[PDB]
Amino acid sequence: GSSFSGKYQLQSQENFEAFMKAIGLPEELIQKGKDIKGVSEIVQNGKHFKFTITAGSKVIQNEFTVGEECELETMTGEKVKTVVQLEGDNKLVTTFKNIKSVTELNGDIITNTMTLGDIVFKRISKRIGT
Ligand SMILES: CCCCCCCCCCCCCCCC(=O)O
Ligand SMILES: CCCCCCCCCCCCCCCC(=O)O
């Protein structure tokens, strides 16, 4: 299975600044990163996922298997042990460092929402070729 597989680019996001401050991203990275339309690549093979998030020269590669412990490297570089689960056939759901993350794919549009307390960091991304 490869439902999620592809290359996507950020179209818009909400509460980037407030969220990145809350989790502790260096101020200069908040400022450089706020208007970057980053590119995310996902390669799915059944339950096995590999994904890359690129923003300028910052490249973060991660991997997980649905249902198994994984170690996710976050935007600060902090690596957190968690589990990623499937919710329905179009969502990827996880919690790391008290952040609840929901990744939802609808055709060519991935909506990613990260919630830390009352802060909801929403990203909308669109497929950009193969
Ligand atoms: C030197 C270039 C500056 C790079 C700093 C920008 C990186 C900051 C992170 C912004 C992208 C947010 C990634 C969200 C991850 C996700 O929701 O899947
Ligand atoms: C920031 C640490 C990694 C995020 C943890 C979520 C793990 C499951 C989802 C992986 C696919 C993420 C693609 C998001 C698209 C985007 O907004 O850039």
Coordinates of C-alpha atoms and ligand atoms in Angstrom, one line a residue:
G1 CA 0.0 0.0 0.0
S2 CA 1.2 3.5 -0.9
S3 CA -1.9 5.7 -0.2
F4 CA 0.0 8.7 1.3
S5 CA 3.1 8.5 -1.0
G6 CA 4.1 11.7 -2.9
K7 CA 5.8 15.1 -3.0
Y8 CA 3.8 18.0 -1.5
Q9 CA 4.4 21.7 -0.9
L10 CA 2.9 24.0 1.8
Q11 CA 0.3 26.3 0.4
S12 CA -0.7 28.1 3.6
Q13 CA -0.3 27.7 7.4
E14 CA -1.8 29.1 10.5
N15 CA -0.2 30.0 13.9
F16 CA 3.4 29.0 12.8
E17 CA 5.0 31.8 14.9
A18 CA 3.0 31.2 18.1
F19 CA 3.5 27.4 17.8
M20 CA 7.2 27.4 17.0
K21 CA 7.8 29.8 19.9
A22 CA 5.8 27.5 22.3
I23 CA 7.9 24.4 21.4
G24 CA 11.2 26.4 21.4
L25 CA 12.4 26.8 17.8
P26 CA 15.2 29.3 17.7
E27 CA 13.9 32.8 17.0
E28 CA 16.1 33.2 13.9
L29 CA 14.6 30.0 12.5
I30 CA 11.1 31.2 13.2
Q31 CA 11.8 34.4 11.3
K32 CA 13.5 32.7 8.3
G33 CA 11.0 29.8 8.3
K34 CA 7.7 31.6 8.6
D35 CA 7.2 32.4 4.9
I36 CA 9.0 29.3 3.5
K37 CA 6.7 27.1 1.5
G38 CA 8.4 23.9 2.6
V39 CA 8.4 20.6 0.6
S40 CA 7.4 17.3 2.2
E41 CA 8.0 13.9 0.6
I42 CA 6.3 10.7 1.9
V43 CA 7.1 7.2 0.8
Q44 CA 4.6 4.6 2.1
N45 CA 5.0 0.8 1.8
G46 CA 2.0 -0.7 3.6
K47 CA 2.5 0.1 7.3
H48 CA 6.0 1.4 6.6
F49 CA 6.4 5.1 6.1
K50 CA 9.5 7.3 5.4
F51 CA 9.1 11.1 5.2
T52 CA 11.2 14.1 4.5
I53 CA 10.5 17.7 5.5
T54 CA 12.6 20.3 3.8
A55 CA 12.6 24.1 4.7
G56 CA 15.6 26.0 3.2
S57 CA 18.7 24.0 4.1
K58 CA 17.0 22.3 7.0
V59 CA 16.2 18.7 6.0
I60 CA 14.6 16.3 8.5
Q61 CA 14.2 12.7 7.5
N62 CA 12.0 10.4 9.7
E63 CA 10.6 6.9 9.6
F64 CA 8.0 4.8 11.3
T65 CA 5.8 1.7 11.1
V66 CA 2.2 2.1 12.0
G67 CA 1.6 0.6 15.4
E68 CA 5.2 0.3 16.4
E69 CA 7.4 2.5 18.5
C70 CA 9.3 5.0 16.4
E71 CA 11.6 7.9 17.2
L72 CA 10.6 11.1 15.6
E73 CA 13.0 14.0 15.1
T74 CA 11.1 17.2 15.5
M75 CA 11.8 20.7 14.1
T76 CA 14.0 21.7 17.1
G77 CA 16.0 18.5 16.5
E78 CA 14.5 16.9 19.7
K79 CA 13.9 13.2 19.1
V80 CA 10.8 11.8 20.7
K81 CA 9.7 8.1 21.1
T82 CA 6.1 7.6 20.2
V83 CA 3.7 5.6 18.1
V84 CA 1.9 6.7 14.9
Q85 CA -1.5 5.2 14.3
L86 CA -3.9 5.1 11.3
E87 CA -7.3 6.7 11.9
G88 CA -9.7 5.7 9.1
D89 CA -7.9 5.2 5.8
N90 CA -6.8 8.8 5.2
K91 CA -5.4 9.9 8.6
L92 CA -2.1 9.5 10.5
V93 CA -2.4 10.3 14.2
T94 CA 0.3 10.7 16.9
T95 CA 1.2 12.5 20.1
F96 CA 4.8 13.8 20.8
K97 CA 5.9 16.2 23.5
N98 CA 2.2 16.8 24.3
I99 CA 1.5 17.8 20.7
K100 CA -1.4 16.0 19.1
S101 CA -0.8 15.6 15.4
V102 CA -3.3 14.7 12.7
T103 CA -2.2 14.3 9.1
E104 CA -5.1 14.1 6.7
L105 CA -4.9 13.3 3.0
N106 CA -7.7 14.2 0.7
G107 CA -6.8 13.3 -2.9
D108 CA -3.8 15.7 -3.6
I109 CA -4.3 17.8 -0.4
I110 CA -2.6 17.0 2.9
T111 CA -3.9 18.9 5.9
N112 CA -1.6 18.7 8.9
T113 CA -2.8 20.0 12.3
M114 CA -0.6 20.1 15.3
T115 CA -2.3 21.0 18.6
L116 CA -0.3 22.0 21.7
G117 CA -2.8 23.1 24.5
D118 CA -4.9 25.9 22.9
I119 CA -2.5 26.4 20.0
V120 CA -3.6 24.8 16.7
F121 CA -0.8 24.9 14.1
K122 CA -2.5 24.1 10.8
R123 CA -0.7 23.4 7.5
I124 CA -2.4 22.9 4.1
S125 CA -0.1 21.2 1.4
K126 CA -0.7 20.3 -2.2
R127 CA 0.8 17.6 -4.4
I128 CA 3.6 18.9 -6.7
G129 CA 4.3 16.3 -9.3
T130 CA 5.8 12.9 -8.8
Ligands
LIG1 C1 18.3 28.5 7.0 C2 16.9 28.3 6.5 C3 15.9 28.4 7.7 C4 15.2 27.0 8.0 C5 14.3 27.1 9.2 C6 12.9 26.7 8.9 C7 12.5 25.4 9.6 C8 11.4 25.7 10.6 C9 10.3 24.6 10.5 C10 9.1 25.1 9.6 C11 8.4 24.0 8.9 C12 7.4 23.4 9.8 C13 7.4 21.9 9.6 C14 6.1 21.2 10.0 C15 6.2 19.7 10.1 C16 4.9 19.1 9.8 O1 3.8 19.6 10.2 O2 4.9 18.0 9.2
LIG2 C1 7.5 17.2 13.2 C2 7.8 15.8 13.5 C3 7.2 14.8 12.5 C4 5.7 14.9 12.5 C5 5.1 13.6 13.0 C6 3.9 13.1 12.2 C7 4.2 11.7 11.8 C8 3.1 11.2 10.8 C9 2.9 12.1 9.6 C10 4.0 12.1 8.6 C11 3.7 12.9 7.4 C12 3.9 14.4 7.6 C13 3.7 15.2 6.3 C14 3.1 16.6 6.7 C15 2.9 17.5 5.5 C16 3.4 18.9 5.9 O1 2.6 19.6 6.6 O2 4.5 19.2 5.7

